[PDB]
Amino acid sequence: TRSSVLADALNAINNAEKTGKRQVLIRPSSKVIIKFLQVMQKHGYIGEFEYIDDHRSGKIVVQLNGRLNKCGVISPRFNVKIGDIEKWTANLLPARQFGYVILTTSAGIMDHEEARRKHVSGKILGFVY
Amino acid sequence: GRMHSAGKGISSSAIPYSRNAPAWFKLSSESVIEQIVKYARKGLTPSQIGVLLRDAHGVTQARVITGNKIMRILKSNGLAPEIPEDLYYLIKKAVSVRKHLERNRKDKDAKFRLILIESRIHRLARYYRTVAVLPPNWKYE
Amino acid sequence: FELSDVKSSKSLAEIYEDDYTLSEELQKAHSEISELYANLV
Amino acid sequence: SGLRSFLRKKTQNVIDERKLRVQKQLDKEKNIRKRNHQDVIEEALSRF
Amino acid sequence: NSWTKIYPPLVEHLKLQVRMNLKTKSVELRTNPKFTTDPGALQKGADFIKAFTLGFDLDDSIALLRLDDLYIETFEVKDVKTLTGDHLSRAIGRIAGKDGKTKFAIENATRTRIVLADSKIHILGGFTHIRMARESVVSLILGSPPGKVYGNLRTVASRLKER
RNA sequence: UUAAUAGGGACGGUCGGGGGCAUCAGUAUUCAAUUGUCAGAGGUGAAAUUCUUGGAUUUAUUGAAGACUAACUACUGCGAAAGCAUUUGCCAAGGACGUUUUCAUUAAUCAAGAACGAAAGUUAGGGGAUCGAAGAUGAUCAGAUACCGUCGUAGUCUUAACCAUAAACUAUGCCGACUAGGGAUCGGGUGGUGUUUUUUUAAUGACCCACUCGGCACCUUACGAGAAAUCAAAGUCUUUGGGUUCUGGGGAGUAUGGUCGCAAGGCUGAAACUUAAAGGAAU
Incomplete structure (x- = not known):
């Protein structure tokens, strides 16, 4: 299903x-x-x-x-605080600045760099690198 | 995708993309509704009614031509079913096989299809009870 | 002895014919061996 | 191998007879086109 | 394609009148009173054609005409054992063997010919010889490994030569 | 609010060696009546029990009983599986296809429990042709034919209940998506086409080509996987997330002041007895 x-x-x-x-x-x-x-x-x-x-x-x-190179969805959509984002970028990406991690926040779905720029957070959808 | 069976057949109706009435269709909506009344008064089911109108009257869909589904048209003017049409026909197929099993007690396979069909009734009966379409006290036989 | 495991070239009449009509091949082998020794000698 | 080869040998055979036969159905149809390209009572009974 | 070599022996040596009926798909044979001399020629010709009909090679079939003590033994695997499906197919394969070798080993040892027409077996040879062949094939049907039968075939062949 | 290449239900013509209840046919086996004849018949590698001058075997005209559907029979069909092959009728069930008919999430997985479940087996009736564990009996000569022959109990069939086990196999959890080509076949539907067909009774086919679904499968290959055999899944771009149940955490030899066992010999008789006959060895 x-x-x-x-x-x-x-x-x-x-x-x-x-x-x-x-x-x-x-x-x-x-x-x-x-x-x-x-x-x-x-x-x-x-x-x-x-x-x-x-x-x-x-x-x-x-x-x-x-x-x-790769695009994936992390399931289920874990809640992520602002501090935790770096940890996620460590786990899912080949290197720190290499690829992106996709977060849905109160402002919508955006990459973690943009979320950091806007000081927003939320739960996680997946990764691309 | 069949449950209680291994078939995966996909034959089915394909609704046209356009949700407006056909241009060639030139019959008043009210006249359609009255025809729906006559067939149901005669005793034909909504599934059968739609077949006749589509076959002989050019009514592609009741909803597209009139803006409303057939049953709500039937319910609007006082015609409603005892039990949902899918659930209804399920029961007679259970009745007929049971009547069969009475005369033929060696029909082990018919005993199975009785198990399959009643379980289908139990699931479907449970669903309608949840939606309140069916009274909570209702039980199958 | 070894029995041939392939189809026989001869037909049953032929082998039957053969039966109707110690070993010549064995004396042939003696002849070359003697010839080889005479040359080697 | 073993039984599987025997089944395999026969299927390719069946495919072979089909090839020979389809080619021949073409052959008559090539023969028919050439043919098309190029007593009163007997007439009275010609329909029968 | 073989008929050019079939009618000459029938018409010349046996002095028989030959024909085949395209309408009935049958080989047509008769005795000519003014030319035929051997009373047993007509049956001999009929027997020879049957051997070719059963599937035997023409040269082997000629043996029926050349010699007077050759018979064709026929039986079915079902008569031996109740085999069906893959078991039946394997039994046929066991008789033939790889490249048809096992059939030839019986053939050369027991001094006969064997035609393995699906589950139908036909053996041509002398009355004793065909029985000797018939024992080997029945053993293979029942499940006997071929290489084991190959050993026994050597034994009987050793006895054939010394007699 | 949609009507999901989710699902349910419906309706149209088909399709099936799917199921049950009756019904028809078919040889074959055995038995029985009659019919003509006469010495054997049967059986195995070689034989003997056995039947037979009250007529065996065989011939032919019939009848009765119980099973079972050859050839056609297919890498073909149906069923969840186990399994299912004569005709006709009744009974209900069903896959797939067609549909511009209907519900609107009704779904996936999964405990206990439940239905059935090849063959064999148990209890109580019926039937009992054939074959046939067991038992009895003939022969016990010869190794390719070396375990056959005759009688034959239970069973093999069926009715009502128990037993629930198979190499009950893809030796291989389920649901969903995606990731190669090719032509053969089955069922349905679409178009074309000209042969077989055929005519106002009615009624509707067969073949060829192409297209589309669904089914048993098959040939060649994996830019993937595996050590390999191999796998269109046992695949999802280095190390890993679509959903979910169950289960799991050396080989081959040698040697032996040990332990435990097994074991040598000198003719037998025959030793407390230099002791017989008869055997052994030698001749």
Whole structure:
């Protein structure tokens, strides 16, 4: 059964970049997914990506340039304080400034650098590096 | 995806994307509602009613043409079912096999499908009791 | 003795023919061996 | 190996007969196109 | 394709009238009163054609015509043992052996021919010889390892030569 | 608020060696009646019990009984599994497909408990053709034919309950997603096409090609995994998070002032007895 649509999406992205497809399809779509993709695009990891609506959950088609080393979802979505963020960046990333860790805070879903800049915190969604 | 069976068949209806009435459809919504009344008064079930209207009257969906689902149209004008249509038909299939098991006591397989079907009734009956569609005291036979 | 484990070239009439008509091959082997010794001698 | 090879040998055989036979169905159809390209009572009973 | 070598011995040595019926898919044989001389030729020709029909090689079939004491022994694996499915298939494989070797080992030792038509076995040779072959094959059907049968085949062959 | 390539229910025509209750056929086995004939028949490697001049065996015209569905029979079908092969009818169940019909999350996993569960076995009736543990009996000669032959109890069939075990196998938890190609087959549906078909009774097929689902599988390969055999899963980009139950934390030899055992010999008889016959050895 389906537990995390986001988990399925990231797994599909990882497999597509695995085998070298330039484009990959994701379904179902969601706001958590789509905001995660906007963050990835701002950090530049992913190229053009494109939302299907079908009057249902919807789909996405995502353009790949092959620079995604790894993207994953940490489950369940642990609560994270401002102090703890560094610990997380230590565990999930190859090096301290290498990759990003994605947090949902009261201000929305953003990377940990932006969360630190805004002095916000919340629970964790996953990692990209 | 079948429970109590290993089949994974996916055959099913595919609702069109557009949620507006077809352009070629040129019948008044009220006339549709009256037709729904006649069939239900005759004794046809909402599933059967939708078949006839779709087959012979061009009513793709009751909701798209009229803006309302069939039952609420039936409930609005005083026609409502004793028990939910899915639950209803489940019982007779249990009745018929039980009537069968009376005459044929060696039908071990029919005894099984009785176990499968009653369990399906128990799960479905539990659900409607939770939603309050079915009175709490209700029990299967 | 070793028994041939492959299909026989000869047909049953042929082997039956062979039966109708100590070992010549054994005396042949003597002949070369004598020839080899005469050359070696 | 063993039994599996024997089953394998036969399936590839069956695939072979199919190849020979499909090619021949093409052959008549190539023969038919060439043919198409190039007593009163007997007429009275020709339909039968 | 073999018929060019089938009708000559029938028509010349046995002086028989040959034909095959395309309509009934049968080989057609008759005795010519003015030319045929041997009363037993006609049955001899019929027996020879049957050997080819059963599946035996033509040259082996000629032995039926050349010699007068050759018979074809036929039986089914079901007659020996109640084998079905993969057990039946393995029994057939055991008789033939790798590359059909085991069949040849019986063949050369017991001085016969064996045709393994699926579960149907036909053995051609002298009455004693076919029985000698028949014992080897039945043992293989029942589960006897072939290399063990190969040992016994050597023994009987040793007796064949000394007699 | 959607109607999830979640799920439920429905309806249309199909599809199945799925199930039960009856019903029809089929040879074959045994037995019985009649029918013609006469010395053997049977059996095994070689034989003997055994049957037989009240007629065996065999021939032919029938009848009765109980099982069972050959060939067609397939890396084909159905069923959760165990399993399921004659015709016809009744009874209910069902996979898949089609659907611009219906519910709206009703779902995944999982204790106890429950249903069934090959063959064998137990209790109490019926039946008992065939085969047949056990038991009896013929023969005990010869090693490829070396364990066969005759009688044959329980059982093999069925009714009502117990027994719940199989190499009951992918020797391999479940649910969900994604990660290669190819053509063969089964069921359904879509389009095309010209052969077989055929005509206002009605009713509807078969073949060819392509497309689409679902099923048993199969060939070649893994940019992945494994030491390997191999694996489209036993795979998910260096070290690890989709959900969830159960279980687990040296090989091969040599030597022996030890321990524990086993063991040598000188003819037997025959020793407290230089002691017989008869054997052994030698001849």
